[PDB]
């Protein structure tokens, strides 16, 4: 209150069903995510950093792993 006028940024922790996949581009990170209520067509890969659900992420690679990288991790 009584400070800089708000007019930028407004991200909200929208409910996430589960990450569909994973793909990197340019150097960043983005995971496909199904959003509740919104039509499946409205798909949008959000940056991992922004994502506040590490548990879901692990859930995705958890199945693909046990072979993934074939090393540490």
């Amino acid at each position: 209150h009584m400070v800089e006028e708000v007019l930028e940024e407004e991200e909200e922790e929208y409910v996430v069903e589960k990450v569909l996949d994973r793909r990197v581009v340019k150097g960043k990170v983005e995971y496909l995510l199904k959003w509740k209520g919104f039509s499946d067509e409205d798909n949008t890969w959000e940056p991992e950093e922004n994502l506040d659900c590490p548990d879901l992420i692990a859930e995705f690679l958890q199945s693909q792993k046990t072979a993934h990288e074939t090393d540490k991790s």
């Binding site: 940024e9 407004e10 991200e11 909200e12 922790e13 929208y14 409910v15 996430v16 995510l33 959003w35 949008t44 959000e46 940056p47 922004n50 994502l51 506040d52 659900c53 548990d55 879901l56």
Partner: peptide, 18 residues
């Protein structure tokens, strides 16, 4: 009670409302 997983879809902008 535990918080359910959630991820910001970079909505931004502003709700249309009415």
């Amino acid at each position: 009670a535990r918080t359910k997983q959630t991820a910001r879809k970079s909505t931004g902008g502003k709700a249309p409302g009415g």
